[PDB]
Amino acid sequence: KETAAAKFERQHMDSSTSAASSSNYCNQMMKSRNLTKDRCKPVNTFVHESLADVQAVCSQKNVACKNGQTNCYQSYSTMSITDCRETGSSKYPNCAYKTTQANKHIIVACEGNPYVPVHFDASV
């Protein structure tokens, strides 16, 4: 139902803020981006940069993905990101997340025409 590109945007893009706004950022975002409906998605990263800057990573440093695929790209610069991870008290359907803000390079897998991100692989 969702294109791979649109799924990436929904799961990983938050250009509305420069960084996570509070310790409850992940609880709020995981819910509103529909990542807690079927189950608690265990781990998810949000990127606080413009969509244009994240799409641009597909023209940056070509690197292997964790799974061995050759269509991954690492950002030349660090980006503001928030790691969201299920923590102690979490049990579906009351998912609970730890919010960890950081500034790191992102690694994404890209596909299609236009060539855009379709998977968030890792941050460094």
DSSP symbols for 53-110: HHHGGGGSEEE--TTS-S-EEE-SS-EEEEEEEE-TT-BTTB--EEEEEEEE-EEEEE
For residue 66, what are the contacts with CB-CB under 8 A and spacing of at least 6? 121, 122
- 85 carries a ligand binding annotation: yes
Assess contact for 118 and 112: CB atoms under 8 A.
Answer: yes
Architecture of domain 1-124: Roll (3.10)
- 33 carries a ligand binding annotation: no
- Tell me which of 119, 120, 121, 123 is the catalytic residue: 119
Q: What angle do CA 17, 20, 25 make, to 5 degrees?
A: 115
DSSP symbols for 24-64: THHHHHHHHTT-SSSS--SEEEEE-S-HHHHHGGGGSEEE-
For residue 11, what are the contacts with CB-CB under 8 A and spacing of at least 6? 33, 35, 44, 120
Assess contact for 10 and 34: CB atoms under 8 A.
Answer: yes
DSSP three-state, residue 13: strand
DSSP 120: E
Half-sphere exposure of 88 (CA within 13 A, CB side): 0
The experimental technique used to determine this model is X-ray
- Tell me which of 12, 33, 48, 105 is the catalytic residue: 12
Assess contact for 120 and 82: CB atoms under 8 A.
Answer: no
Domain ranges of the chain: 1-124
DSSP 124: -
Strand partners, 98: 85
- Look up 12 and say whether it is catalytic: yes
Assess contact for 18 and 53: CB atoms under 8 A.
Answer: no
- Look up 119 and say whether it is catalytic: yes
- Give the other-Cβ count within 10 Å of 31's Cβ: 13
Resolution in A: 1.8
**Cα–Cα distance measured from residue 36 to residue 29, given in angstroms and rounded to the nearest whole number:** 10
- 118 carries a ligand binding annotation: no
Strand partners, 46: 82
- 43 carries a ligand binding annotation: yes
- 45 carries a ligand binding annotation: yes
**Cα–Cα distance measured from residue 99 to residue 54, given in angstroms and rounded to the nearest whole number:** 21
